[PDB]
Design a binder for this molecule. Structure first.
Ligand SMILES: *[C@H]1O[C@H](CO)[C@@H](O)[C@H](O)[C@H]1O
Length: 478
């Protein structure tokens, strides 16, 4: 089967995590409140009434967790820095204890021969910026994020050589500002009554625009002041479902392409070509911001690599609607498509625990080829890929460890990835499994177990290896 030999020399294997989902210690060492602290402590927002105040306590347990990575022979660990641990109020006074913590984490990883791949922003905006100017909705976020990024480059970039500025800006724009299912939970209240404020037709495009500009501002700083002496690289992690046409007809083929342009192209077309996709300009019109000439010049080419967070593939059909007033405008209607994991009464594949996560290994290879062809073969890392078990209190821990479905998922998606590189010529440089440990899965709380290690929430967060731990250890053998 698969071995390191199935991938290019030097191909990087790792696991991925995110600060708010893993760290806990939410009030420790001067940490500022974030929009997710506020959101997880608001009624109705988290399905199982939980929060990540303690999470899996990686803030105190990182050395134990690093040994768990080393036990499998991982090359790398993707983690995020909590902005509010560095600047508790977003800007202003730096929190030395935050710098000190992440230095300890980085040094502990390197002491075990594990390379740090660091995400600057994994959704945990300091609440002080949300309060001051509504965070990503205001242009001020661009300069504030860039200053925060600069502090990280300055403090950590002598050791950190792979930076991911932003995690899934598409997810944040849609879930935070169209559906209102993730922090800050804004949307058109006429579409979804649970939201307090927002506009599903306009706010997602503003937020996305500011993410793109924020990346380019940090990248400009990195390139001008840090990159020559640090010799590192910067990218972004895009959430990308693969889309297949719901029928092999010209109208549904164009629909799947359009759905992809509204998902990945929304962000990637600016970074490679200096403007949004034409289809978005045509359909979103004046609700889609325009780059200035000077902005386009800083935005185009601002990525060193493309991070791809990929789980699943849906079918996409053309959709005709031409009335939502303005009052019901939303991003899905804007696409002119509907995407679903069902065709002619049949699901596209087996499903993991998450209701959205269909197991479709071929989509990994199809997406690698799409990125290669559309964007002229940029370097790509799979910055997130994996699947979840339920959190099932009616079975024993021993039965919860038998994650044969996860093994087959990683086997099949990795086989497809290996082929995209070897047969198709895709420039993929590494792969990061979501996730090292079971953790707090945003609005799903503790109901979803994505970990290679099982976490016993009822026994002081004890970590147990699922079967997939041995499978990865065997894969990564030298
Ligand atoms: C990628 O998706 C996983 C699973 O939904 C999530 O936990 C991460 O935060 C995200 O980056």
């Amino acid at each position: 089967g698969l071995t390191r030999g199935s991938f290019p020399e030097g191909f990087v294997f790792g696991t991925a995590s995110a600060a708010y989902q893993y760290e806990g210690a939410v009030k420790e060492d001067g940490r500022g409140q974030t929009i997710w602290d506020t959101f997880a402590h608001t009624f109705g927002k988290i399905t199982d009434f939980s929060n990540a105040d303690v999470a899996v306590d990686q803030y105190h347990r990182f050395e134990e967790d690093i040994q768990l990575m080393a036990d499998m022979g991982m090359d790398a660990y993707r983690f995020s820095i909590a902005w509010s641990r560095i600047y508790p109020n977003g800007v202003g006074q730096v929190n030395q204890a935050g710098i000190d913590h992440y230095n300890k984490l980085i040094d502990a990883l390197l002491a075990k021969g594990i390379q740090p791949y660091v995400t600057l922003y994994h959704w945990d905006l300091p609440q002080a910026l949300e309060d001051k100017y509504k965070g990503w909705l205001d242009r001020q976020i661009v300069d504030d994020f860039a200053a925060y990024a600069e502090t990280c480059f300055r403090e950590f970039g002598d050791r950190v050589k792979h930076w991911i500025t932003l995690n899934q800006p598409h997810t944040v724009a849609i879930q935070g500002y169209d559906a209102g299912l993730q922090a800050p939970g804004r949307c058109s209240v006429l579409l979804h009554l649970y939201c307090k404020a927002g506009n599903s037709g306009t706010e997602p495009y503003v937020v996305a625009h500011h993410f793109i500009l924020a990346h380019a501002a940090a990248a400009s700083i990195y390139r001008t002041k840090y990159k020559a002496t640090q010799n590192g690289q910067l990218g972004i992690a895009f959430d990308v479902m693969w889309f297949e046409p719901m029928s092999n007809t010209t109208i549904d083929i164009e629909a799947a392409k359009r759905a992809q342009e509204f998902q990945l192209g929304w962000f990637a077309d600016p970074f490679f070509f200096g403007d949004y996709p034409a289809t978005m300009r045509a359909r979103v019109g004046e609700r889609l911001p325009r780059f200035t000439a000077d902005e386009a010049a800083v935005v185009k080419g601002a990525l060193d690599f493309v991070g791809i967070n990929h789980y699943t593939t849906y079918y996409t059909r053309h959709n005709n609607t031409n009335i939502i007033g303005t009052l019901l405008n939303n991003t899905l209607a804007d696409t002119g498509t509907v995407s679903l994991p069902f065709k002619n009464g049949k699901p596209i594949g087996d499903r993991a625990n998450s209701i959205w996560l269909y197991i479709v290994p071929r989509g990994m290879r199809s997406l690698m080829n799409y990125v290669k062809e559309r964007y002229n073969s940029p370097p790509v890392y799979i910055t997130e890929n994996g699947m979840d078990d339920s959190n099932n209190p009616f079975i024993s821990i021993k039965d919860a460890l038998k994650d044969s479905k996860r093994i087959k998922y990683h086997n099949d998606y990795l086989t497809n990835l290996a082929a995209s590189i070897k047969e198709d010529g895709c420039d993929v440089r590494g792969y990061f499994a979501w996730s090292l440990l079971d953790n707090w899965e945003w609005a799903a709380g503790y109901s979803s177990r994505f970990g290679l290690y099982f976490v016993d929430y009822k026994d002081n967060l004890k970590r147990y290896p699922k079967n997939s731990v041995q499978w990865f250890k065997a894969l990564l053998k030298t």
